[PDB]
Amino acid sequence: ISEGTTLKDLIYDMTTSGSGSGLPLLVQRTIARTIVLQESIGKGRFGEVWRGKWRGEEVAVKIFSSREERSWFREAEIYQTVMLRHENILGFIAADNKDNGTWTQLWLVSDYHEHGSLFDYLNRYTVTVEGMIKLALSTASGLAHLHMEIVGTQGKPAIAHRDLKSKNILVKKNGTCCIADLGLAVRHDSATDTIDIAPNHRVGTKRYMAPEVLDDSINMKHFESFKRADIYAMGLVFWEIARRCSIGGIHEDYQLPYYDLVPSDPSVEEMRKVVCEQKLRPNIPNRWQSCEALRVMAKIMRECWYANGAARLTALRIKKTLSQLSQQEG
Numbered sequence: 001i002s003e004g005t006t007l008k009d010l011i012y013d014m015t016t017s018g019s020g021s022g023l024p025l026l027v028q029r030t031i032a033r034t035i036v037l038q039e040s041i042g043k044g045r046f047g048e049v050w051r052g053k054w055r056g057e058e059v060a061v062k063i064f065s066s067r068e069e070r071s072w073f074r075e076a077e078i079y080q081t082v083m084l085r086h087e088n089i090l091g092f093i094a095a096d097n098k099d100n101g102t103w104t105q106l107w108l109v110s111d112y113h114e115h116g117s118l119f120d121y122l123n124r125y126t127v128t129v130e131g132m133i134k135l136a137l138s139t140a141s142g143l144a145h146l147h148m149e150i151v152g153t154q155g156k157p158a159i160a161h162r163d164l165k166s167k168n169i170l171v172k173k174n175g176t177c178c179i180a181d182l183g184l185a186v187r188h189d190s191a192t193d194t195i196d197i198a199p200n201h202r203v204g205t206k207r208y209m210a211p212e213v214l215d216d217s218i219n220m221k222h223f224e225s226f227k228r229a230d231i232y233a234m235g236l237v238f239w240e241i242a243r244r245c246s247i248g249g250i251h252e253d254y255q256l257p258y259y260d261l262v263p264s265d266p267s268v269e270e271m272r273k274v275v276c277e278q279k280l281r282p283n284i285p286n287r288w289q290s291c292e293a294l295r296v297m298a299k300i301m302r303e304c305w306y307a308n309g310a311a312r313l314t315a316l317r318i319k320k321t322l323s324q325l326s327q328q329e330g
């Protein structure tokens with residue numbers, strides 16, 4: 001990397017390039033070994049997220065442990081060798097392995113966002129009518145790009161998230177959402193009908209798990225079942241976004257789905273009794289019937305919380321309906 005080059009210039013070099021893939025392997029190795037670590041920003045299920053600084057500019061670094069090498073490679077392979085660079089998808093920068101053995105350092109570099117995740121943003125701030133649509137449209141457009149498959153070698157395979165939640169979705173400076181953490185994700189090619197992962201066990205957060213996954217009725221051979229499972233998880237995220245929407249002071253306190261039906265850190269058996277056995281779904285308050293924006297969101301939510309997978313809406317359908325709703329108020 002030559003003198004005077006900035007991170008903002010590097011983003012343009014990979015996005016407007018001939019191939020929509022990431023930065024070169026030698027360039028990616030240089031970036032990771034130049035990042036000045038400032039402070040630990042947060043932690044999830046795999047690794048620890050740290051706030052770094054490359055040539056003055058703020059950057060996000062995910063330091064993975066030597067034991068969790070599977071989670072590091074899966075995310076790095078999905079972010080690189082596919083061609084997926086979208087506005088509503090986390091802007092990947094670099095992936096590097098420093099040492100060897102038990103003291104192996106696994107790094108994952110991406111764009112930094114001051115507001116943080118949707119979970120931290122909603123618990124701290126109250127959204128407006130126009131703002132609520134912007135967060136929902138971006139989340140719908142994000143998964144629409146992931147599920148979209150372009151056939152002809154130069155395109156991208158169909159990817160299912162498998163673990164969609166408010167903690168996994170980050171919010172940008174302009175109030176736009178970007179999908180993050182693709183460590184548990186699954187790739188699919190329609191030309192040969194093959195899936196990279198080993199399908200046999202349940203994955204992700206139990207709170208956001210689909211009923212088909214919970215009662216083992218899900219057909220793991222079918223890729224559409226994984227796509228439809230993400231739609232149900234997106235509907236639970238859509239429930240909490242519209243809940244914090246204030247129309248003249250009237251707004252509800254931020255709570256996770258099934259907060260009154262399930263406690264913190266739930267088991268497989270406990271979540272099965274609410275979703276599968278009793279067929280209970282998150283409560284939609286009466287005040288939501290007042291305005292158009294809150295009423296349309298509630299209609300999509302019930303059309304995403306179906307017991308049957310095939311009956312649920314598609315990622316492009318939620319994207320198209322929200323785009324028409326946004327045009328009503330600009």
Ligand SMILES: CCN(C)C(=O)c1ccc2c(c1)NC(=O)/C2=C(\Nc1ccc(CN2CCCCC2)cc1)c1ccccc1
Nearest residue numbers: 042043049060062108110112113114115116117120180181
């Ligand atoms: C390519 C793999 N990586 C690095 C990620 O997936 C990843 C993960 C996480 C982040 C990120 C990227 N970029 C960020 O800005 C990230 C995160 N940004 C962030 C930035 C600032 C805060 C502080 N926050 C506290 C609550 C009120 C609002 C401000 C909280 C989170 C982050 C880190 C840990 C858990 C949840 C969110």
